[PDB]
């Protein structure tokens, strides 16, 4: 699809069998989800956002279906205003910015 | 242009007489630039995300040239770690996300 930016580019994702809304966020290097249970071991990761650097949990090779497309990659979990799909997974979708 | 997302989507802008680089960010509702002088009246605002919150000054109707295209809109200024072009200016470019 082609998504304009007059509203937030919120899409529906499926992760761990649950549908959730998430924001397609080209200013986010990584994908960060609100607290949820994910499989496997995690490791610590420090990420930078608008208010500073914060430690989150990093899970690897997590499948997510975004608009019906299946991606698999690193997902971080920690405090966040919303579920954020960053460039690590948008590149798997083939997403580009166009003007 | 069509900009892929393997790297951060950084472009050159010109604002308030100053040339700088900024991030095209579909996850940012409004443009926020690192602290600088802008003309005119402003209003205090708080913006929040992964760092927590930062206080900014909101300037209205500020002209910015982005990749040579002249656009106009609200510009927030404050201690952001990076210059961010948000949706409020990306729409004026006719910028879409496509996959
Ligand atoms: C978190 C989203 C919902 C909101 N932010 C936009 C995001 O793109 C934000 C932009 C950014 C890049 C690098 C350093 C600092 C900030 N990237 C971000 O945090 O990347 C993290 C999350 C995982 O990957 C790394 S914002 O900066 O808080 C924001 C809020 C309001 C306005 N008007 C403008 C900006």
Structure tokens of B65? 């040239």
Going across the sheet that includes A96-98, the strands are: A2-3, B96-98, A96-98, B2-3
User: What are φ and ψ of residue B30, in 5° steps?
Assistant: -125, 145
CB contact under 8 A, B97 and A9: yes
**C-beta separation of B77 from B36 below 8 A:** yes
Nearest to B27 among A4, A27, A54 (CB): A27
Contacts of A41 (CB under 8 A, 6+ apart): none
Structure tokens of B86? 């948000």
CA pair distance B60, B75, nearest whole angstrom = 6
Per this entry, what is the length of chain B? 99
CA pair distance A23, A57, nearest whole angstrom = 19
CA pair distance B15, B75, nearest whole angstrom = 10
Structure tokens of B85? 């072009």
CB contact under 8 A, A98 and B93: no
Q: Is A55 on the interface with B (CB under 8 A)?
A: no
- Other C-beta atoms closer than 10 Å to the C-beta of A91 total 16
CA pair distance A14, A88, nearest whole angstrom = 17
Tally the domains of chain A: 1
Domain of A56, CATH number, reads 2.40.70.10
Resolution in A: 1.6
CA pair distance B60, B81, nearest whole angstrom = 21
- Other C-beta atoms closer than 10 Å to the C-beta of B90 total 26
Residue in B82, B77, B71, B84 with CA at minimum distance from that of residue B59: B77
Q: Which domain holds residue A79?
A: 1-99
């Amino acid at each position: 699809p082609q998504i304009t930016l007059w509203q937030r580019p919120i899409v529906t994702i499926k992760v761990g069998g649950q549908l959730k809304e998430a924001l397609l966020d080209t200013g986010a290097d990584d994908t960060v989800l609100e607290d949820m249970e994910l499989p496997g071991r995690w490791k610590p990761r420090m990420i930078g956002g608008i208010g500073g650097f914060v430690k989150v949990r990093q899970y690897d090779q997590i499948p997510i279906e975004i608009c019906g497309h299946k991606v698999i990659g690193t997902v971080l979990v920690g405090p966040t205003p919303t579920n954020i799909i960053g460039r690590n997974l948008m590149t798997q979708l083939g997403c580009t910015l166009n003007f």
